[PDB]
């Protein structure tokens, strides 16, 4: 019935055909440039070239999804477009983008080992989205093939706007970014293998740019000697930000809170309320639809037995505005505490929405407070 | 509807659930049997006297350390200043058990060990507690024990048990002379476990595989109607009343209790809970009331900090029945250790967590009729150490602060200057000086446009080496005209286009069409929360609106010459896989 | 932190299954040798037990006279010594933490990750939510939503799910719309009773002895829904339809019409009607008013 060992055919088909169905819902649905393609056309072609260029039949080969998202990051980033992690994380996790199948439920009949090299590693979700990222920019070379400059200074936007943060601490992170580096961030962390244990923690530039945002918010709110930062607003931003709300943006985030792997970000399902639940059930019946994989029709009229079957809330700008106007009163010790639990929830919300580890974060801006100190001191 | 149509569809009752009230109390992968806290009351005077709540708390470095400090009971439960003891065994479950009310309110304390086991004695007056240590028997058996149970000392080791007594007061130690085992060679965990039943010198004991009653002063010996096929004995725990038994199988509550003076089994229905977890423990809590008496069953896991509770209740017909789940959490990272209990309901216990040596009272309330974070990871990483790297973090932030000073009175003047014929005049030389240099970059894109290697040419979208240039003007809408006529002017071919307001979609996550009204929204939102909102929030767009500025590879025409080239180095049929427009 | 309507993700926890209970074989073997293939592993999980109306269990009378220590360090030690190398052999063939796992099981100490919380899919997490949604909302009373619910979910083609009695007394409290409890129940009974392990205890079973709660609570309350009227030759139509001999339960239920139709001759053959089906009750064990309290109602009937 299905093929042996050339299926490498059939397979890199499945893959490219997946590829360009997620690119038409990016261009489509997501209003991408149609240059795009051609940027995937020459990194998936430069890696297909490579991997044939090798000449096992022992396969060798691993384009699981990651690979996917791999080389999308990778054209965008060439791109220069603002879009960054976060963004596939959510749009894959909310079954917007298609991706959590092979084929998905409607196709082809491939030999097992394929389709377990498709739904195996299928998980962003510690960094294996970095990883995968920066080991494709070894596979074929960021350096002079493509611009594998980050888009910056969109993501300091997307970060104040994603707290409450009034619109200084842009040009606070800003130049603390321009302090350690002067503004040069590259994609590659690449020596292939698995092995690293010293100075590689902290080079996605991603990572770095949200620890030195944290250390940021950490240094200029504890170091106020102007005192500009109220001890009070300090707690009142963290409750405007804490405040569960319902628009696209934060039941997403709840979307992606049910399948990060640790916890407390389940128990944070737990303390989530009816609407929340509700407009849940309504995602799985529509985004799962992406499913995958006589008595038929006795279930089709068995389950026909029971029936199949202004706006209310508000956009993401609605929502930004109205916890910067409930902060918008702004004209001793343990105001440290506020410092610390605002820092602690922001650290939250990052942790879901870039799929990282509480402990990758923490060793990413512990290592990269150190190389602030170091080039301080 | 058993007894309500055996006579001749709701509830009984309505949806009533879970609160909190919290204290501090006193302060110190492959798990095994193990679970070492204890809170009772007894007084040892009897010359007609009262009870005193005590606890039995554990002090650890190697556990070594065995405390035992008096409670004074209050609506605040506190305690008052402590007594103490060691062993140099790593120390197990404390227990200090009492038999109910057929008799007498008890005496004193034992405890498990690495090796040991040893019996406490206690007298006490004016606020302490001196015990005496009744003496300890390292082994006979280089065996561990499992359980405890309580006058008779009994000892489970893993598969084989023994009845014993305690000595009287002082200094002769704790002998035996009936025994047994249970031995399952199929049953590889450790834990076993002794409580008996009915105090009518009648015994349980038990492994994750099976439950046996043992009358052990006659010859006695039974394995009570299931066995290990579907689910392990979890946990079991005598809840309170002599008569009474609560069991913890997997996915099930068992409230097994004698209804007939001979020892029982219960298969009075029973409610089920869900895991796969090993480490699940359980313990109840019993208040009274005129019609019912009704019972609590806390369990708890070593995994998640959530408890899992349901209730029962005992009409005294022997009437037990069900009423409906309630779950609540518990807080940051790891789980509960130890929890012990002693037209609404008032449930109160103490918990203690995995690694972390404080004991805390709650207290769980019906209705409402009436983070202080040290997250060791991240403050290790917020308050660093050395004064010079205190005075570091300052001298940093004052760097930057005068920096943004700069900013600000810089940016000023060139806020005065709008729609200026100065602010044009820069526009016009602004607009075409770029175009110039443009064009530099497009001939050295041309004389380098064989590359046909790659597909990105070298260090593109810029504003291409002239930087002064972008910042000074400061009028967003004019600005967005001088950029709509920059694309239009670069209209001959070969060139980059890429349309904005489709990915300031991503930016506010909502049409954008305008690079305006981008600055509107941003303008809104921050003019409810800075001066000079107009400054920055100008000096933002200005930036991201640089940031994305695009000036990319020659266009459209340009990539397919490598995007066919690099389809002819790969071998042929690679080549023939390379398929655009699927489907 | 609760039970999740899926069957679980695979192998790890299946192999895992193996290596336990192939160690526990060899153990036991020695041991009863000392007191003298997924077929093995069949067989090897086989041999082992797989004033209010108190369906009471089988108390302590009629069971053995103990036993006097087996297991003392040296003799455990000396039935262990020998099956944890045998295990040496296929633990090479196992992953590191498959293998880590059967060390510790081995030791006696407990794995501290459930099943569930080292899981690892899209489609399968999403049903999830939308049961636990569908069991909240019918403990919420909201059957509006919970029927939304249901209906959403019945649509999916993924898992079969037991959880039978969550959908019984769940479209039993729903009353909403969808072809009811009595329908599911009947449609269980007629989908499992024919030929046509891990995941079972006794509240959702198999139709070739008793397949025990849903049934007799349907029976019961379909009878409480005669306490709706004073419909019971409906009720006992169709438990007289099926045949599943191991009930007794539902001649219980047959005598209970035939005392609610006996509330002039036609009233006498119900009687001794019911007069009979309360011995052909006695067939199986047992469900007993004192009985001489049935027959005294059916001497107040005999007035």
Redesign the interface.
């Given at each position: 019935k299905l093929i042996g060992h050339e299926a490498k055919?059939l397979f890199?088909?499945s893959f490219?055909?997946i590829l360009?169905?997620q690119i038409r819902w990016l261009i489509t649905e997501?209003?991408?440039?149609?240059?795009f393609e051609?940027?995937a056309?020459?990194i998936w072609?430069?890696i297909?070239?490579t991997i044939?260029?090798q000449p096992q039949e022992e396969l060798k080969l691993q384009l699981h999804m990651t690979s996917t998202i791999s080389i999308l990051y990778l054209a965008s980033t060439?791109?220069?477009?603002?879009?960054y992690t976060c963004?596939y994380i959510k749009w894959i996790c909310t079954?917007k983008m298609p991706?959590?199948?092979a084929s998905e439920?409607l196709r082809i009949q491939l030999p097992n080992y394929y389709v377990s090299i498709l739904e195996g590693s299928?998980?962003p979700f510690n960094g294996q989205l970095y990883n995968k990222i920066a080991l494709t920019c070894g596979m074929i070379h960021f350096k002079?093939?493509?611009?594998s400059e980050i888009?910056?200074?969109?993501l300091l936007?997307?970060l104040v706007?994603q707290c409450?943060l009034?619109?200084?601490f842009?040009?606070?992170t800003?130049?603390?970014i321009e302090?350690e580096e002067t503004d040069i961030r590259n994609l590659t962390l690449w020596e292939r293998t698995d092995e690293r244990h010293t100075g590689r923690v902290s080079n996605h530039a991603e990572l770095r740019v949200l620890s030195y945002f944290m250390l940021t918010i950490?240094?200029?709110l504890?170091?106020?000697?102007?005192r500009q930062y109220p001890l009070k607003w300090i707690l009142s931003l963290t409750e405007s930000l804490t405040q569960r709300t319902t628009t696209?943006?934060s039941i997403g985030r709840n979307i992606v809170k049910?399948?990060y792997p640790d916890?407390?970000t389940?128990?944070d399902?737990?303390?989530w309320s009816?609407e929340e639940?509700?407009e849940?059930?309504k995602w799985?019946?529509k985004?799962?639809l992406?499913?995958?994989?006589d008595?038929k029709i006795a279930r089709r009229k068995?389950?026909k037995?029971?029936?199949?079957?202004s706006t209310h809330q508000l956009?993401?700008?609605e929502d930004?505005?109205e916890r910067?106007?409930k902060?918008?009163p702004?004209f001793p010790p343990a105001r440290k505490?506020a410092?610390?639990?605002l820092?602690?929830h922001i650290?939250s919300q990052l942790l879901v929405d870039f799929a990282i580890s509480?402990?990758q974060l923490?060793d990413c801006?512990?290592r990269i407070?150190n190389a602030?100190?170091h080039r301080?001191? | 509807v058993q007894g309500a149509s055996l006579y001749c569809t709701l509830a009984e009752d309505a949806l009533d659930l879970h609160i909190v009230v919290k204290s501090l109390l006193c302060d110190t992968s492959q798990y095994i049997q193990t679970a070492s806290d204890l809170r009772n009351y007894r007084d040892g005077t009897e010359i007609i006297a009262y009870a005193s709540g005590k606890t039995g708390s554990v002090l650890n470095i190697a556990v070594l350390t065995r405390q035992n400090t008096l409670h004074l009971n209050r609506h605040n439960n506190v305690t008052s200043i402590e007594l103490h003891s060691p062993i140099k065994s790593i120390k197990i479950p404390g227990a200090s058990e009492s038999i109910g009310r057929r008799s007498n309110l008890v005496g004193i304390i034992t405890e498990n060990s690495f090796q040991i086991f040893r019996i406490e004695s206690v007298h006490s007056r004016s606020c302490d507690v001196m015990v005496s240590s009744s003496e300890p028997l390292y082994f006979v058996e280089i065996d561990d024990l499992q359980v405890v149970d309580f006058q008779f000392a009994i000892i489970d080791i893993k598969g084989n048990w023994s009845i014993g007594r305690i000595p009287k007061n002082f200094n002769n130690q704790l002998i035996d002379n009936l025994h047994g085992t249970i031995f399952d060679p199929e049953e590889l965990s450790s834990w076993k476990r002794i409580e008996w039943f009915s105090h009518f010198q009648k015994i349980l004991v038990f492994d994750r595989s099976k439950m046996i009653e043992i009358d052990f002063m006659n010859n006695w010996q039974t394995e009570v109607v299931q066995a290990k096929a579907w689910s392990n004995i979890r946990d079991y725990k005598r809840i309170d009343d002599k008569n009474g038994i609560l069991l913890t199988s997997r996915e099930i509550i068992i409230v097994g209790a004698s209804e007939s003076n001979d020892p029982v089994r219960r298969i009075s229905w029973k409610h089920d809970l869900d895991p796969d977890d090993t480490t699940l423990r359980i313990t109840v809590q019993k208040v009274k009331k005129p019609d019912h008496i009704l019972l609590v069953a806390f369990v708890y896991s070593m995994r998640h900090k959530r408890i899992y509770m349901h209730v029962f209740s005992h009409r005294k017909a022997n009437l037990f029945q069900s009423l409906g789940c309630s779950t609540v959490l518990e807080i940051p990272g790891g789980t509960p250790t130890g929890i012990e209990t002693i037209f609404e309901l008032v449930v109160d216990f103490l918990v203690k967590l995995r690694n972390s040596s404080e004991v805390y009272y709650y207290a769980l309330s019906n209705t409402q009729n009436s983070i202080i974070v040290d997250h060791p990871e991240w403050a290790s990483l917020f308050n660093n150490a050395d004064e010079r790297e205190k005075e570091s973090i300052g001298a940093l932030v004052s760097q930057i602060k005068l920096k943004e000073r700069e900013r600000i009175s810089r940016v000023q003047n060139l806020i005065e200057h709008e729609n200026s014929h100065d602010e044009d005049k820069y526009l016009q030389d602004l607009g075409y000086r770029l175009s110039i240099a443009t064009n530099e970059l497009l001939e050295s894109w041309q004389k380098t446009k064989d590359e046909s290697i790659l597909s990105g040419s070298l260090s593109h979208s810029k504003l291409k080496n002239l930087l002064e240039n972008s910042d000074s003007f400061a009028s967003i809408p004019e600005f967005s005209s001088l950029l709509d006529q920059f694309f239009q002017y670069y209209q001959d071919q070969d060139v980059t286009f890429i349309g904005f307001e489709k990915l300031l979609h991503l930016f506010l996550h909502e049409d954008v069409p305008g690079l305006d009204i981008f600055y509107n929204k941003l303008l809104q939102c921050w003019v409810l929360v800075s001066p000079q909102a107009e400054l920055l929030t100008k000096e933002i767009v200005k930036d991201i609106i640089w940031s994305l500025a695009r000036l990319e590879k020659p266009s459209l025409f340009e990539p397919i010459q490598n995007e066919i080239s690099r389809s002819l180095s790969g071998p042929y049929q690679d080549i023939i896989s390379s398929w655009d427009m699927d489907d | 932190m609760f039970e999740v309507p899926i069957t679980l993700t695979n192998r790890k926890f299946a192999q895992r299954r193996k290596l336990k209970y192939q160690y526990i074989n060899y153990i036991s073997r020695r041991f009863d040798r000392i007191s003298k293939q997924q077929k093995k592993r069949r067989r090897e999980r086989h041999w082992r037990s797989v004033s209010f109306e108190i369906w009471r269990t089988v108390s302590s009378q009629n069971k053995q006279p103990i036993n006097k220590q087996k297991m003392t360090y040296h003799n455990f030690k000396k039935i262990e010594k020998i099956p944890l190398r045998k295990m040496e052999i296929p633990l090479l063939h196992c992953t590191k933490e498959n293998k880590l796992y059967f060390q510790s099981i081995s030791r006696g100490l407990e794995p501290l990750k459930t099943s569930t919380s080292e899981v690892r899919n899209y489609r399968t997490r999403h049903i999830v939510t939308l049961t636990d949604l569908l069991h909240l909302n019918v403990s919420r009373h909201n059957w509006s939503l919970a029927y939304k619910i249901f209906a959403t979910l019945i649509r999916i083609p993924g898992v079969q799910i037991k959880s039978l009695w969550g959908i019984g007394v769940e479209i039993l409290d729903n009353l909403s719309n969808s072809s009811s409890g009595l329908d599911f129940l009947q449609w269980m009974c007629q989908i499992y009773s024919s030929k046509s392990r891990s995941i079972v205890p006794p509240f959702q079973t198999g139709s070739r002895t008793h397949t025990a709660k849903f049934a007799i609570t349907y029976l019961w309350s379909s009878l409480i829904n005669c306490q709706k009227s004073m419909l019971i030759d409906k009720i006992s139509e169709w438990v007289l339809t099926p045949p599943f001999m191991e009930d007794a339960e539902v001649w219980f239920i047959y005598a209970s019409c035939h005392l609610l139709k006996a509330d002039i001759n036609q009233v006498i053959k119900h009687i001794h009607y019911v007069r009979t089906f309360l011995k052909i009750c006695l067939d199986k064990g047992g469900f007993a008013v004192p009985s001489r309290l049935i027959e005294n109602q059916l001497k107040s009937f005999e007035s």
């Open positions: 055919l890199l088909k490219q055909f360009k169905r997501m209003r991408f440039p149609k240059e051609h940027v056309k020459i072609l430069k297909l070239k044939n260029d060439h791109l220069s477009l603002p879009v963004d079954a991706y959590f199948q439920i299928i998980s002079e093939f493509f611009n888009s910056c200074q969109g936007l997307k706007m409450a009034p619109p200084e842009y040009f606070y800003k130049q603390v302090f950490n240094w200029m504890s170091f106020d000697r102007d696209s943006e049910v399948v916890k407390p389940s128990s399902y737990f303390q009816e639940t509700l849940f059930l799985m019946e985004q799962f992406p499913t995958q994989t008595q068995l389950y037995i029971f029936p199949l079957d956009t993401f700008i930004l505005q910067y106007a902060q918008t702004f505490e410092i610390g639990r820092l602690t650290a509480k402990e923490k801006i512990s407070k602030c100190l301080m001191n | - | -």
